[PDB]
Design a protein around this motif. Structure first.
Motif, short mmCIF file in Angstrom:
data_model
loop_
_atom_site.label_atom_id
_atom_site.label_comp_id
_atom_site.label_asym_id
_atom_site.label_seq_id
_atom_site.Cartn_x
_atom_site.Cartn_y
_atom_site.Cartn_z
N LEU A 191 -1.77 -2.06 -1.69
CA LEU A 191 -0.78 -1.16 -1.11
C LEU A 191 -0.77 -1.29 0.40
N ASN A 192 -1.82 -1.83 1.00
CA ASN A 192 -1.82 -2.28 2.40
C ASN A 192 -1.74 -1.14 3.39
N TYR A 193 -1.98 0.11 2.99
CA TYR A 193 -2.15 1.19 3.97
C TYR A 193 -3.50 1.07 4.68
N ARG A 194 -3.48 1.38 5.96
CA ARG A 194 -4.62 1.13 6.85
C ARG A 194 -5.21 2.45 7.35
N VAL A 195 -6.40 2.30 7.92
CA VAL A 195 -7.06 3.40 8.65
C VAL A 195 -6.50 3.34 10.07
N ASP A 196 -5.80 4.41 10.44
CA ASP A 196 -5.02 4.49 11.69
C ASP A 196 -5.94 5.08 12.76
N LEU A 197 -6.71 4.20 13.38
CA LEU A 197 -7.57 4.57 14.51
C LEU A 197 -7.31 3.49 15.54
N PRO A 272 -10.98 -2.20 9.35
CA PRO A 272 -11.41 -1.95 7.98
C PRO A 272 -10.56 -0.84 7.37
N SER A 273 -10.03 -1.12 6.18
CA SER A 273 -9.05 -0.29 5.50
C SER A 273 -9.24 -0.28 3.98
N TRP A 274 -8.74 0.78 3.39
CA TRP A 274 -8.66 0.89 1.93
C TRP A 274 -7.28 0.39 1.49
N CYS A 275 -7.11 -0.93 1.56
CA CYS A 275 -5.80 -1.53 1.19
C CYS A 275 -5.57 -1.42 -0.31
#
Ligand SMILES: COC(=O)C1CCN(C(=O)NC(C)(C)C)CC1
Length: 460
Positions: A191-197, A272-275
């Motif tokens: 789904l390619n959503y990232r950690v927005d920091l 680093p993300s929960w893609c």
């Protein structure tokens, strides 16, 4: 040999990074690694259905089927049957089932959706599979959404295009998208959503991951924040994430996150993300329990780690009575009383309802409702006690109380649905007026509500 009232379903999603897998991938199917993992005592117990989604998959269908089937046979000593396989570009879905289920599975559908336009058409989109398992409809979507930390809105648009245009399930349910067609719908993928920091915080984020302190990262996960603001995946569930970000790793280890911008990344950072995610939506008051949600630690050919989720899911039997199927059962009835729809629309057409359910011989159209103005600006459509009495095919309460009524509210002028929802018949009482309620959506966005009372007559 009794028909089951529960099955277990394995969902896997893995972005393979265009690389062949390593020789052993059994940890994936065993739900072993980080997060909510499966107990060792269950390792030989096969799941009923395995649904594998891949992205950036470099293998042929034949090559991947051989790996998957040999993996499951090694774990379980069962030779699984292939239900369906569908590939769009390098996005693939495989459904495998225990052989005992072969004559419980029918109405198998596959489809794909290509997202984007011109520049943005050619590698992202989704594949899906649906089927009936006895009396229960199951849908599965594997999507690879748009990449890049600053493209969350494009991902949300990709989601809406996929749920509008993916053609799965019963085509007679014409007002309904995939978010209403199935008893249980599983939507997973990259789904390619990232950690927005901020980029400057990369090493801080790595530190937090090494300490297994995910709270301050998850509070910036774009999928959780977009869902909380009702921008995407409205009315879906996700298990709590208790595993490290699954992207972006240096290949051949899991010791290093590779986040810095490179020509190969289009000069983009990949913090680093929960893609890689699994979500689901089941009809109201149907049993569904997530029993694992995690990532593997020992499969390192890709810059993503595989993700697993497993579920208990309630299923029903293919019911035959002396009457239905093939006639109604006069001992059964569904009455909708004092119902009204509240709609967000500014239009002033008249509206009618359609009631769709596999407990009816065919869908039922209501009379037009009576439009009034709500105190805070809204359209209220009143149906009163005018709604047609619904005649189910089977009156047995062991069947009828497990059913659901889909509702569409349609414009008289255009016959277009302005909202869709679902009512469970799993009532506290029969022959008793009871409150009902569903939100109404259209193209997966909130458009209104439907509320009122129901009175259900069964043979008991
Ligand atoms: C496997 O299910 C079935 O086929 C049956 C189930 C129960 N049943 C009847 O009892 N029909 C009678 C009263 C006419 C005898 C309908 C058909």
């Amino acid at each position: 040999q009794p028909e089951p009232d529960m099955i277990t379903i394995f969902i896997g999603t893995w972005n393979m990074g265009n690389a062949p897998p390593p020789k052993k991938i059994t940890s994936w199917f065993l739900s072993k690694g980080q997060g909510k993992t499966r107990d060792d005592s269950a390792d030989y117990i096969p799941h009923d259905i395995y649904v594998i989604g891949t992205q950036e998959d470099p293998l042929s269908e034949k090559e991947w089927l051989e790996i998957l089937k040999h993996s499951l046979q090694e774990i379980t000593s069962v030779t699984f049957k292939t239900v369906a396989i569908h590939t769009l570009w390098n996005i693939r879905i495989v459904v495998l089932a225990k052989p005992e289920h072969e004559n419980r599975i029918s109405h198998i559908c596959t489809d794909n959706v290509k997202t984007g336009i011109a520049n943005t058409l050619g590698n992202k989109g989704a594949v899906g599979v649906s089927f009936m398992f006895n009396g229960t409809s199951l849908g599965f979507v594997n999507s690879h959404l748009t990449s890049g930390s600053e493209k969350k809105l494009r991902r949300n648009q990709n989601y809406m295009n996929i749920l509008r245009f993916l053609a799965l399930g019963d085509k007679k349910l014409s007002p309904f998208n995939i978010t209403h067609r199935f008893t249980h719908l599983f939507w997973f993928g990259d789904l390619n959503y990232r950690v927005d920091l901020p980029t400057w915080e990369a090493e801080t984020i790595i530190q937090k991951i090494k300490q297994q302190q995910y709270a301050d990262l998850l509070s910036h996960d774009q999928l959780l924040t977009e869902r909380r603001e009702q921008k995407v995946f409205l009315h879906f569930e996700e298990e709590e994430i208790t595993f490290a970000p699954t992207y972006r790793f240096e290949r051949l280890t899991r010791d290093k996150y590779a986040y810095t911008k490179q020509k190969a990344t289009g000069m983009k950072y990949n913090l680093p993300s929960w893609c890689d995610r699994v979500l689901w939506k089941s009809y109201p008051l149907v049993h569904v329990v997530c029993q694992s949600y995690g990532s593997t630690s020992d499969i390192m050919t890709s810059d993503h780690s595989p993700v697993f989720a497993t579920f208990e899911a309630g299923v029903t039997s293919q019911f035959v009575s002396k009457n239905g199927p093939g006639t109604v059962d006069s001992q059964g009835q569904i009455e909708f009383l004092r119902c009204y729809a509240t709609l967000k629309t500014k239009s002033q057409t008249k509206f009618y309802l359609e009631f769709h359910s596999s407990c009816l011989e065919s869908f039922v159209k209501s009379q037009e409702g009576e439009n009034e103005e709500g105190s805070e600006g809204e359209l209220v459509v009143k149906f009163g006690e005018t709604l047609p009495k619904l005649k189910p095919i089977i009156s047995d309460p062991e069947y009828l109380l497990d059913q659901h009524i889909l509702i569409s509210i349609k414009s008289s002028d255009s016959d277009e649905s302005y909202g869709e929802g679902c009512i469970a018949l799993r009532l506290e009482a029969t022959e008793t007026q009871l409150p009902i309620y569903t939100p109404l959506t259209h193209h997966g966005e909130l458009t209104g509500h439907f509320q009122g009372e129901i009175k259900l007559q069964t043979s008991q």
